[model samples]
Target: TPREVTLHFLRTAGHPLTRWALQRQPPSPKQLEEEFLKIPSNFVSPEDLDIPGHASKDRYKTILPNPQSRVCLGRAQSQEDGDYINANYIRGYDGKEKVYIATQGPMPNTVSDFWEMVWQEEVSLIVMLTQLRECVHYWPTEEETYGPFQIRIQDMKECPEYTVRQLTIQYQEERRSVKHILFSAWPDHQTPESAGPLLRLVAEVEESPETAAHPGPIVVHCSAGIGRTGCFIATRIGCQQLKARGEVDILGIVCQLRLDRGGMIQTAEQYQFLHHTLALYAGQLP
Candidate 1:
């Protein structure tokens, strides 16, 4: 639990918050799985799903963002669905700043809106965790235009686990280069055969200057954008927790993610994978 991790860290460091915790060592995969299963699927309100033209009805149930931290279209009007994209503002390490934008795969019509938000938010790093078949390609291909936004791939590099592309996006006269990493190892509905690929990708994102030094949210997405998206975010946060503080509270991290976007860490399997993944990361941290 986040409370436990915090309290335990504080208890050892001599803070006064009362929290019960076992030894701060990472729990074994089995123990972590069992503990993860005990958490409630619905801990907070999935509020504002029907925020009037905010999200498409077709997408509402599929990739709805949490009302509390969802991104607005920035426009004052609606076109079919509200100006909402199925994306949320995810906090970065230590929960001090909004760092990532977790969103769903783009629909054909939503492509422009997606780019619009990207342009408006000044997103420079995009982390694609699922395949293109899941969401129609909203990215720039060679030379493509989404409304006023023009996308051109400046460069690309492929790895066994993922691919990185340097994109030059231009909206009118303004242009910027965005780093996009497509982690091609995971399926939308389930965990990968091994968590190694995802972990490596996570490590790369954590080490990137675009995410660390740049001033825009790192956009992340999958099919629905909640399940795998949640796992990636939780794992990143958990890794940060362990490295900086020497302990972890898986429960706490998941809870915080849900507050930003509903249904983070969608399954017990994913929850367990996070623990195991973090333990592996912990081994490599110091």
Candidate 2:
């Protein structure tokens, strides 16, 4: 079960709201939900999609990207509908734009475009937060071609909670190596039981030597690319805030994310989990 995997990871790799725990008591469940409901969600209506067949590219009909922050693909794939992909450029803590890209699981027809975006964006790390069966197998076991990109799995490391793979993607004359991590402990539309494994995963990605070299956004996705995806990114940023300044503003963080993409933290439950997760993170900070 997923719970067992988190237990194993916590037992093996032991790993933060920050001053909030010290300056004031953690918010009560009721308070947490009240604050969560108050945050405005910048939902994009279906009428906003002017492209004739844009609905076909989306996995969920109602979940659409904010036009302002959507990642626009190049004209290299000219035949496709005017450079539309269901992805958004999300900001990181301290306001560095394009720190991450939150996108939905690639559909059957959009698989090639997914790889094309990865290559063009010069992305080095991709964190998949859901099960592989939920989306198309965008990565190859050994080697395969997706669009103009030739993806080959160079190596793989299996962790208790996740599987990390080293891959090299080649375009016409240039080649690049990227890291892809599939985290399975998180259930669909639900949060993980423990924050420890998720913290370790976040730390592993942050400390990895590869991310230092790659200048592009770290692509993160779930089914609709909002629920667990937003939590992971929020944790990443919140942990940094805690470690650096001994504080974190989770509400502000979620608001910022929603500004980039609507419905970021999908549920009141998920919002509560983010607080719990960050609190656990802060407790271990010292």
Candidate 3:
């Protein structure tokens, strides 16, 4: 018999949410259905979920047959092989167009695969790749050369000690029309606060009218993509929605995300930090 793994989001202050223990079992199907009904009528799921090719089948296939191949490939080629791809790809109407957001596991394979899939969908890909103290690289030859695509790489070590204002100015100078911003970085586990700089970076992006218009949507992923990724994504959804709605149900968004992506955000700690960060920031509004 297949063992069932339940997921729950609890508020906490930790580097990785799952780094702790499972707080409580995720709501049963009956419970989820009941709670989902209580959400607002206008609350619709994001569309980025439907963009396909985010998953792969061969669990052990880390290296693509061709490093320069334009096609997106995954570490796990099939569900039967690995559980990397979760329900995170849920899609529905957001009163405008359907908004979809999902965590793209780890890279170099995962990142390459993700872009390949994005290209196939013909949707322009925008990424905010941030490096704290280390340098990360993406293969240039593989990226869609002609279409609408942009990548903003922020090196914290290079621009350390700059206020959010300066950072935003620098980012804007490079790619001023960035609508959607996704952040990915390796967390300095020794200094969990390393995530703070990136969060501040996104905050700066959020404050800009031009950047916030599409708000695009921010995606955060580390190695597992769940730990820091969850924290950032949860924060993005909570903060972004609150800015638009004046008030947000942080728990509600978390729950809906779980349903869409099979407890995607992952750990209780990651989930809670999202709420805590949102509350702290949202409360500052006058």
Candidate 4:
């Protein structure tokens, strides 16, 4: 019955790819490859966009969540949940589980709203997976202000793989520490050479004091919030599942994620990279 339920979920959720199954046991490497191949059929073509809204300023074309799962802001005087933000509430490993808000890169018009969303969501950690030009100006060398919030870069450290900046955000009379992680190597619509450095980045996020202290959702964004963003979030969840359960259900994770917010894992290559990342991570777990 649960197997049939999965079929219903896939068919009704309207994912553009691989919706052809009655469901079965956990996929082996071979079966997973079959599933991976199905992605190219329905991966990149996402539906809907938050048009006539401020979010339309940037790549204004992305899928809107099924109402219930989308993240909403109070800025638009909007009753509809899909007014702005191509983000959704993502539940995490062994975790109301609003652990991460997977979103797109910030644009010129949406910069203030982006920071405001962070304060409104009580986000303490932000994981940015792209080195976008529009996003570059969102954060200054040391300090900046967006709306009522003042962001001060406490430290900026450059690493071979990515850059790490620690920021202190002062909103009104309250202060919160937010860590912004920039992973600059991922290309627009392709997979990386290896998942090692990305896996290490996930480890750093899991080990952060801000992550431990501030329990709000961690804001994660790439250009589209579907391709590279999906890959990073999936890798993190898959890593945790492998560490805790000795194995991971990557296919199931992607399916569940898409139901929450469509298109969590974008490319066939990205999906395979998730399996690759999990296999690499599983080998190192104690």
**lDDT tens readout by residue for model 1, 7-80:** 35322331111112322344566866776665544323335355665445235454466566878787522243
Misplaced by over 4 Å in model 3 are 1-100, 105-112, 121-136, 140-199, 204-220
Tens-digit per-residue lDDT, 1-286, candidate 3: 1112222332211121221111223334453354434322211122323324433522222311111111222423222222223213333223222144344333455443443333332222233333455422442322222123344333223234222211111112243322334343434222134446545755654554642335332333344333354445556665666566555554555554444433334444444455445555555555
Question: What is the number of backbone collisions in each predicted candidate, taken in the order shown?
Answer: 4, 4, 22, 0
State the C-alpha lDDT per candidate: 0.71, 0.82, 0.37, 0.69
TM-score of each: 0.82, 0.89, 0.47, 0.80
Q: Is candidate 1 or candidate 2 better by lDDT?
A: 2
- The candidate, 1 or 2, that scores higher on TM-score is 2
Put down candidate 2 lDDT per residue, 113-183, tens digits, no spaces. Answer: 88888977889999999854457778888999887678999999999889999999997788888999989
TM-score top scorer: 2
Using alpha carbons, what is the TM-score of model 4? Answer: 0.80
The lowest-lDDT stretch of 10 consecutive residues in candidate 1 is: 14-23
Ranking of models by TM-score: 2, 1, 4, 3
Candidate 4: regions farther than 4 A off = 1-7, 11-30, 37-58, 75-83, 94-96, 131-136, 211-214
1-286 per-residue lDDT for model 4 (tens digits): 7535654655443222111121223345676677865432222223333245533544544445444567777753223333466578887775437888887777776677688788778898898886433354687777888777798999989988888898988866888888888888788677766888988889889888854454899888877777777788778887776666666666666766665666777767677677667767766767
- Which candidate tops lDDT? 2
Question: Considering summed lDDT, which 10 consecutive residues are worst modelled in model 4?
Answer: 14-23
